[PDB]
Write a protein that binds this ligand. Structure first.
Ligand SMILES: [Zn+2]
Length: 230
């Protein structure tokens, strides 16, 4: 009953309750001829919501805040973007308009500025070297070296063990690595390992696109990366 690409008209957003006070958001985008689903996270912050990743574009992101309001009723006050690609930063401006404070690592900020994609206002200190981790309200942000992009963050909800992989973790059903335009394929499976090791207590893994699952996604993701490589 996790929503899939075929049940979401582009422009619309679904919320999926992952755990007490942790939801994923799912939306769809035109990409490479195809239509992709894409995931993010919303996490209760005591009094407010912390948002991980935009809904992939202004419209979606508008649709996203509206859906939150109607289903949760708490105010999104902060947003973290896990990499500089448009499915992560696309709609920052809408979030800013909405009074949301946007964050990304300095690394993501540089890389997104260079590409002319929307740029997260604030900078996260403490993530520049691989294996680093900072606490950001109810989540831990972790920088597992380079995988799908050189700046990809992953996110742990310790009060639920929910691991959000971002675009560096593939869904089981997925057979290829993704857009590999900016990937570090050589480093990527080491980076995935750095995640396995740092988060063994993880009960749910959420991938950048597709159905969630368990720690198997990291392994699945590793094989997948190895396989594209020859
Ligand atoms: Zn990407």
């Amino acid at each position: 009953e996790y929503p899939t690409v075929n049940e979401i008209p582009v422009g619309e957003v679904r919320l999926y309750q992952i755990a007490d006070g942790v939801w994923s958001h799912i939306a769809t985008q035109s990409f490479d001829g195809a239509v992709y689903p894409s995931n993010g996270l919303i996490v209760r912050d005591g009094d407010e919501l912390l948002l991980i990743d935009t809904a992939w574009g202004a419209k979606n992101t508008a649709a996203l805040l509206a859906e939150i309001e109607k289903q949760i009723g708490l105010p999104v006050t902060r947003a973290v973007s896990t990499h500089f690609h448009d499915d992560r930063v696309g709609g920052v401006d809408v979030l800013r308009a909405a009074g949301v404070a946007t964050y990304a690592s300095p690394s993501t900020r540089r890389l997104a500025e260079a590409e002319g994609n929307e740029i997260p206002t604030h900078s996260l200190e403490g993530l520049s070297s691989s294996g680093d981790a900072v606490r950001f309200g109810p989540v831990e942000l972790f920088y597992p070296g380079a995988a799908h992009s050189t700046d990809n963050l992953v996110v742990y909800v310790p009060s639920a063990n929910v691991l959000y992989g971002g675009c560096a973790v593939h869904e089981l059903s997925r057979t290829s690595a993704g857009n590999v335009a900016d990937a570090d394929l050589a480093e990527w499976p080491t980076s995935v390992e750095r995640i396995q090791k740092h988060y063994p207590e993880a009960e749910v893994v959420i991938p950048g696109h597709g159905l969630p699952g368990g720690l198997d996604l990291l392994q699945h993701t590793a094989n997948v990366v190895k396989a594209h490589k020859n």
